[PDB]
Amino acid sequence: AIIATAFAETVKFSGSKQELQKRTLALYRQFLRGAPTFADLYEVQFSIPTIRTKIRQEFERHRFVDDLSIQNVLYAKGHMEYQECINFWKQQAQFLKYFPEEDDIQGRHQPSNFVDKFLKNRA
Amino acid sequence: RPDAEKRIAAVLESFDKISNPAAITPTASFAKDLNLDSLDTVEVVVAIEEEFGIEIPDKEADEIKSVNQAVEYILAQ
Amino acid sequence: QSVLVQMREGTPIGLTGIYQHPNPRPALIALYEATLKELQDKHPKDSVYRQSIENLTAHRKQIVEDNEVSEVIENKIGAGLIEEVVIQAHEELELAKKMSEWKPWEELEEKPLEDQWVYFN
Amino acid sequence: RYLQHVSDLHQYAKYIMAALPKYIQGFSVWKDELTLHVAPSAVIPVTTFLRDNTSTQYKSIIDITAVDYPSRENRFEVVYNFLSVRHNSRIRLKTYATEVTPVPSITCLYEGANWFEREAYDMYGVFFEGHPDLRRIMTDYGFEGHPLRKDFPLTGYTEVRWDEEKRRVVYEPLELTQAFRNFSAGSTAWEPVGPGRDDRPDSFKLPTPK
Amino acid sequence: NIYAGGSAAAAPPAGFRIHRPATWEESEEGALSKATKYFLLAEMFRGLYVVLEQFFRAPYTIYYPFEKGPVSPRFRGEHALRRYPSGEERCIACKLCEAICPALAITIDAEERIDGSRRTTKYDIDMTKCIYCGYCQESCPVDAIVETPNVEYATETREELLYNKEKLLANGDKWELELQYALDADAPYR
Ligand code: SF4
Ligand code: SF4
């Protein structure tokens, strides 16, 4: 395989943290710009701002990561996920892995205190 | 180009983490004057370019830090 | 001067993609002289690498320089066809040019840990 | 023949180490199989030497993979397999790579190799720096985890079923109707094989004094 | 001799240089003779004639619901728990067929009675996941489970497809004489 696929980039490992910060910056710009495509493409029920606030809160999850090479693998995994999402490779049931809390409320009795955990012995 | 900063203020007003919608001056810094993050900066710039239909490269997206630079950039079309 | 090492158009021989090379012996001996010149200039005379490739291309060049016809030297070399021999001489030449900058004759730079090449014993 | 031939293979590999002392850490032979023990920053020059020398022209990547031993600090070992179709010979090349650090990719040299490299990527999470189209292959697209890895269980984490409500398949944590019962617990408590003899030729083991 | 190095006795063979492809003028047939094959489709009618030869011979086809194809005695189909002559269950709860199964279909519960003999309270094969390797027949020392050569047992639910002890003892009841015949004919080669 000589030529690559469409949105791919050669996986290459930066030696500094600021260059990685620039790359994750451009990456969030790519997700956020392609967010109107995903609602048309995967036929979701909901609004484009919920896609955008999810992309934001999935980069909130790894804001305080110190180690450089763990940021490096995290960037490579994020670019692979962008690559799958911007094409039609993922389907609409694996795109909705990302939104389990939105689609339906499962029922009563979400346990909060120790008693509600304990009546069904920590579920 | 009149009525542009009113449109940019209308876009920038619809967000959160801004406890003063009246603090949008035409020389407002995103990080300093409005208390925005890095992700907030590249959220507001994408929401700015979404309003028009234009598209921006990386070297012209990474440099925008204030709304003065957005109103300086606006006349590319 | 330049040299051509593989015709990709001409009359066919048994290997496809490889066609018959016009005048393979001058190409061959000039490519050899490039190998000898490079490894004499750039590799230091202790190292095993330049010693065997010097002896190698010397004994290989002797067969080419001292016999004339096609089929008898491609039996006396014992490797493949003369087009293919020109290609692998081109290839060992490019190798010998990469080795002057990759510098293999040093000591090893990355020592293994003591508990690493231990499988099940 | 075969005793002579394995003693010849020993000497060939002794030569291969002496030609490149900066890059080759070890070599081991076991029954007409040759393994070259190479650092991870040492992959590309050794593979060019294996492609390019006339004594050593392997030309053709067959199969590459990783293997994890979690009991070592550098977890995965990445093993390469080559075939000189001229000299009718096989050779093997082992490096190492932790979960987080890379190994560089030989897809600049070997054109078949890239598909193998992303296979071993998905099964093991081992990185190939310098590789176009590094992403998953032969697993699920939204699959979280690396399967051929010792912390990953047998049946995995998730399972698939059709929810009627959402009118789509949903992904759920694992519930079995019959639990997996490994019978590895119940192996032998005596040592099953001895140490065994050696096939080292007399020329390549260290002399006793006097 | 000594070879060049980088080089062995596996030279190219005598004649591996293949000749130049012959031109139009070093051809044995005329252009008119070649054009008769070109325009009149000489080898098209040959392959037409082959399929017409196949039209006039007697076909290979067989009626399924009234004839079954040729089978071996060592063939494997649905399971059966055998019995002894003079009526005895023959599965001694020895637990080998459960330990060998490459898909873990067997599930056995074993309990011992006052008599001192050993049997199974619950025998079970999941036939959604039995794979028909016949190792379970090969492992049992007393020859208590076999593979009857029946294949015509397709069901409509999965709960029918979970074979308990009673269904497999019924299968050992019905298939017995052909089962014993197949095992006796197999028995020299085992
Ligand atoms: S035939 Fe194979 S899979 Fe089926 S019960 Fe016997 S050993 Fe198990
Ligand atoms: S069928 Fe054979 S292996 Fe299975 S419980 Fe009975 S005697 Fe043991």
Side-chain angles (χ1 to χ4, degrees):
Chain A
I2 301 287
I3 195 64
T5 310
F7 293 97
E9 67 182 0
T10 300
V11 64
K12 182 176 70 69
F13 290 162
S14 65
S16 67
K17 298 183 71 68
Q18 184 177 2
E19 185 178 359
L20 191 280
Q21 184 178 2
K22 184 175 181 181
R23 292 178 69 187
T24 60
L25 189 65
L27 187 65
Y28 180 72
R29 186 177 65 247
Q30 290 176 0
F31 288 112
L32 186 63
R33 184 177 292 172
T37 302
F38 294 164
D40 189 1
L41 185 62
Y42 294 98
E43 292 180 354
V44 298
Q45 296 295 325
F46 62 92
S47 297
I48 298 171
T50 301
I51 297 170
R52 295 181 177 174
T53 190
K54 187 186 167 62
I55 295 168
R56 181 177 65 83
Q57 71 187 351
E58 293 294 327
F59 289 174
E60 295 290 330
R61 183 177 292 172
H62 294 89
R63 184 177 293 276
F64 293 99
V65 175
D66 191 1
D67 191 0
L68 181 63
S69 192
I70 298 171
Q71 297 177 1
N72 192 1
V73 48
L74 186 60
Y75 181 73
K77 295 180 182 297
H79 182 74
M80 292 178 191
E81 290 177 357
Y82 179 72
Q83 181 66 42
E84 294 179 354
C85 287
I86 194 63
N87 292 316
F88 196 68
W89 291 349
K90 189 180 286 291
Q91 294 180 356
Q92 67 183 356
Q94 315 180 352
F95 183 77
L96 294 177
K97 290 177 71 70
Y98 293 100
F99 294 96
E101 66 181 1
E102 183 178 3
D103 294 328
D104 186 74
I105 297 169
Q106 296 293 323
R108 292 178 69 188
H109 296 285
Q110 299 289 334
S112 179
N113 60 4
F114 181 79
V115 175
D116 292 331
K117 277 179 179 179
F118 181 76
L119 294 172
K120 59 178 188 128
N121 61 9
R122 292 181 295 103
Chain B
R1 320 193 71 182
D3 292 331
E5 64 184 4
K6 181 173 73 68
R7 184 177 290 171
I8 303 301
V11 173
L12 183 60
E13 184 179 359
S14 297
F15 291 165
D16 61 356
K17 292 183 263 71
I18 297 171
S19 296
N20 192 358
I24 299 168
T25 187
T27 61
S29 178
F30 292 164
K32 293 181 181 180
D33 186 76
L34 294 175
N35 192 0
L36 295 176
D37 292 332
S38 63
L39 281 75
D40 292 327
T41 300
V42 293
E43 183 179 1
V44 62
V45 172
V46 173
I48 289 166
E49 60 88 18
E50 185 179 2
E51 181 66 27
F52 292 163
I54 62 170
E55 69 275 15
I56 60 177
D58 59 354
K59 293 180 181 180
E60 293 177 351
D62 186 75
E63 292 178 354
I64 296 173
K65 298 292 183 181
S66 298
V67 64
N68 192 1
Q69 293 178 355
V71 177
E72 182 66 27
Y73 182 75
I74 193 168
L75 62 80
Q77 182 62 256
Chain C
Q1 65 182 356
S2 295
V3 63
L4 62 86
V5 299
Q6 180 178 3
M7 293 299 289
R8 292 183 185 270
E9 184 179 0
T11 185
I13 65 175
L15 280 77
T16 185
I18 296 170
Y19 293 96
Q20 185 176 2
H21 187 278
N23 290 319
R25 294 178 68 198
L28 195 51
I29 193 167
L31 186 59
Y32 287 165
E33 291 176 356
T35 303
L36 274 70
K37 182 174 72 173
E38 193 273 333
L39 60 86
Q40 287 174 5
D41 291 333
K42 299 296 183 181
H43 294 89
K45 65 179 70 176
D46 192 0
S47 67
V48 179
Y49 182 78
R50 68 182 295 285
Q51 290 176 0
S52 300
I53 298 174
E54 185 177 1
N55 194 356
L56 183 62
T57 310
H59 181 73
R60 188 180 275 270
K61 186 178 181 292
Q62 183 178 2
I63 298 169
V64 177
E65 186 178 358
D66 291 332
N67 297 116
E68 291 180 354
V69 296
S70 170
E71 293 84 3
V72 173
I73 61 103
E74 72 188 355
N75 289 319
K76 283 176 181 175
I77 298 298
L81 282 67
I82 305 174
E83 294 83 4
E84 188 178 0
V85 170
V86 175
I87 296 160
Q88 65 183 356
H90 180 76
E91 184 178 3
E92 65 178 355
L93 186 267
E94 293 178 354
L95 182 64
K97 287 179 181 177
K98 292 181 180 179
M99 292 298 108
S100 175
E101 293 178 353
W102 290 351
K103 193 181 261 73
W105 61 87
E106 295 185 352
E107 64 182 2
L108 61 84
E109 64 182 3
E110 292 181 354
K111 293 182 181 179
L113 295 173
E114 64 181 2
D115 291 330
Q116 195 276 130
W117 294 120
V118 175
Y119 294 101
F120 293 103
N121 288 316
Chain D
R1 190 268 308 275
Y2 183 76
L3 184 63
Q4 189 272 331
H5 178 70
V6 67
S7 67
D8 192 2
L9 198 151
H10 290 87
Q11 183 177 2
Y12 181 74
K14 183 177 180 179
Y15 180 72
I16 300 300
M17 179 181 286
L20 281 74
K22 181 178 177 175
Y23 294 105
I24 295 172
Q25 297 180 354
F27 64 92
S28 80
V29 52
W30 179 67
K31 289 172 72 173
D32 71 356
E33 293 178 353
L34 181 56
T35 302
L36 273 69
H37 304 81
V38 176
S41 296
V43 176
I44 297 169
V46 177
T47 54
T48 59
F49 181 75
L50 295 175
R51 183 179 63 84
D52 289 332
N53 188 1
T54 54
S55 179
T56 301
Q57 53 177 8
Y58 292 101
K59 298 292 183 178
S60 65
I61 192 65
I62 298 166
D63 184 70
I64 74 173
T65 185
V67 177
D68 61 350
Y69 294 173
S71 176
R72 294 183 293 178
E73 294 180 353
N74 295 114
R75 186 181 181 172
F76 298 98
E77 63 179 5
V78 176
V79 54
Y80 293 171
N81 289 314
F82 294 101
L83 176 63
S84 66
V85 301
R86 179 70 53 84
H87 295 287
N88 193 359
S89 296
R90 294 175 183 272
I91 200 169
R92 187 180 294 115
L93 188 149
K94 293 185 184 177
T95 62
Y96 62 85
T98 305
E99 182 178 3
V100 177
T101 193
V103 62
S105 67
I106 61 170
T107 187
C108 182
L109 296 172
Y110 292 94
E111 183 59 32
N114 60 5
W115 185 254
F116 293 95
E117 289 175 358
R118 56 180 294 170
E119 190 272 329
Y121 179 75
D122 204 1
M123 294 302 169
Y124 293 103
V126 175
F127 292 158
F128 292 95
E129 185 178 0
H131 183 269
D133 289 334
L134 184 65
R135 65 271 174 105
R136 69 180 65 252
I137 188 170
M138 70 185 67
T139 59
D140 192 3
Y141 293 103
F143 182 76
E144 293 179 353
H146 296 282
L148 191 49
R149 182 183 283 176
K150 300 291 185 183
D151 60 355
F152 182 82
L154 181 59
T155 62
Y157 296 96
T158 61
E159 67 182 0
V160 182
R161 66 175 175 91
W162 181 256
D163 192 0
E164 184 177 352
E165 292 180 354
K166 304 186 184 183
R167 295 295 189 279
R168 66 179 175 88
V169 299
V170 294
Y171 291 170
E172 290 178 354
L174 192 275
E175 295 290 329
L176 293 173
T177 303
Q178 179 66 259
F180 182 71
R181 295 178 293 173
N182 60 1
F183 294 106
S184 64
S187 178
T188 62
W190 292 95
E191 182 180 2
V193 296
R197 64 178 177 87
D198 60 354
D199 199 1
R200 297 178 70 191
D202 292 330
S203 297
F204 291 156
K205 61 178 74 71
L206 296 174
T208 185
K210 183 169 71 172
Chain E
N1 57 5
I2 191 66
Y3 293 97
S7 295
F16 184 76
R17 301 288 300 166
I18 193 157
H19 300 291
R20 293 182 183 174
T23 61
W24 61 274
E25 65 184 2
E26 295 179 353
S27 67
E28 63 181 4
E29 64 183 2
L32 188 64
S33 178
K34 186 183 288 185
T36 303
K37 292 183 180 182
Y38 182 78
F39 291 105
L40 294 175
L41 279 76
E43 67 270 23
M44 303 290 285
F45 291 100
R46 186 178 179 178
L48 284 168
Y49 183 76
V50 173
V51 301
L52 185 61
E53 291 295 320
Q54 291 298 104
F55 182 75
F56 292 102
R57 294 179 178 179
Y60 287 116
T61 166
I62 70 173
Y63 295 94
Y64 181 60
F66 295 100
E67 178 175 5
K68 270 65 187 296
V71 174
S72 180
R74 293 190 294 272
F75 181 76
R76 61 179 68 96
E78 67 183 357
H79 297 279
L81 292 175
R82 292 180 67 190
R83 294 183 181 277
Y84 290 100
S86 69
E88 184 67 32
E89 292 180 355
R90 195 189 281 276
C91 183
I92 61 173
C94 73
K95 301 287 183 69
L96 290 177
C97 60
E98 182 179 1
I100 47 94
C101 183
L104 296 173
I106 309 293
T107 300
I108 302 174
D109 190 0
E111 290 178 357
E112 182 176 359
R113 182 66 178 173
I114 298 170
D115 292 331
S117 295
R118 296 293 298 268
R119 296 289 182 271
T120 63
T121 299
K122 180 175 72 69
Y123 184 77
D124 188 7
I125 305 177
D126 189 354
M127 300 293 295
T128 66
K129 64 179 69 168
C130 175
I131 65 161
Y132 293 94
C133 54
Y135 292 168
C136 67
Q137 186 178 0
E138 290 178 356
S139 65
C140 175
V142 296
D143 194 2
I145 189 172
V146 291
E147 301 284 331
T148 60
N150 186 5
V151 295
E152 293 85 2
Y153 63 99
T155 65
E156 291 180 354
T157 59
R158 180 182 293 176
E159 296 178 353
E160 186 178 359
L161 191 54
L162 297 177
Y163 289 172
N164 56 5
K165 184 174 70 67
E166 291 83 1
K167 181 70 175 176
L168 293 172
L169 292 175
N171 290 319
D173 191 1
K174 293 187 263 75
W175 293 95
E176 181 66 29
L177 293 175
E178 295 302 320
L179 188 151
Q180 184 67 41
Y181 182 76
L183 294 175
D184 290 331
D186 191 358
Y189 294 101
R190 297 292 184 184

